Design a protein around this ligand. Structure first.
Ligand SMILES: CNC(=O)c1cc2c(N[C@H](c3ccc4c(c3)OCCO4)C(C)C)ncnc2[nH]1
Length: 164
């Protein structure tokens, strides 16, 4: 039920959209969160996704962390998608603004391959400091499953498409 996506490759599609609004209309099987190792959903996609669940995502995330400890950079966990999706795949991409190794971005994208279809943001772009053009490149070169990328910024969306 994804509509208005531009085809980039056989399995990668892209749209200028807010991933929260896209998730509510579609209610996909998997929505990807741009998470940190602590699952503290304060800003960016994480804060926007959590706010849409009335904080139910954060309460569930704190219980997960209390039992399992923090995730690894490049790692992921599957939790409830609440009112946005069946599941939320919380993926930790490297935060370049915190000195984390950009090489871990491919490892972060590999988590996508465990799911047939996903609605996702561009990993490590935004407040994480990675180059969004590099992030799209790693995505197309790593994900083999069907991924629908939601890019919030119109001017970034245009730049991404015109340079692909
Ligand atoms: C109220 N809604 C929002 O604040 C919102 C932001 C947002 C988003 N932003 C992108 C991004 C990529 C990757 C991230 C990220 C942000 O946040 C931290 C780390 O990972 C780029 C284009 C800025 N993409 C899709 N839906 C989004 N919704």
């Amino acid at each position: 039920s994804f509509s208005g996506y531009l085809k980039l490759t056989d399995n990668v599609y892209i749209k200028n959209a807010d991933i929260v609004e896209e998730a509510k209309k579609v209610k996909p099987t998997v929505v990807v969160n741009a998470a940190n190792v602590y699952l503290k959903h304060g800003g960016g996609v994480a804060g926007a996704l959590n706010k849409a669940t009335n904080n139910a995502m954060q309460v569930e995330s704190d219980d997960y962390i209390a039992t399992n400890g923090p995730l690894k950079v490049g790692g992921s966990c599957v939790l409830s998608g609440h009112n946005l999706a069946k599941h939320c795949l919380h993926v930790v991409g490297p935060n370049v603004n915190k000195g984390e190794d950009i090489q871990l971005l491919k490892s972060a994208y590999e988590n996508f391959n465990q799911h047939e279809v996903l609605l996702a943001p561009l990993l490590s772009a935004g407040i994480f400091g990675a180059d969004p053009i590099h992030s799209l490149r790693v995505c197309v070169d790593t994900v083999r499953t069907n991924v629908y990328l939601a890019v919030f910024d119109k001017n970034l969306y245009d730049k991404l498409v015109s340079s692909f």
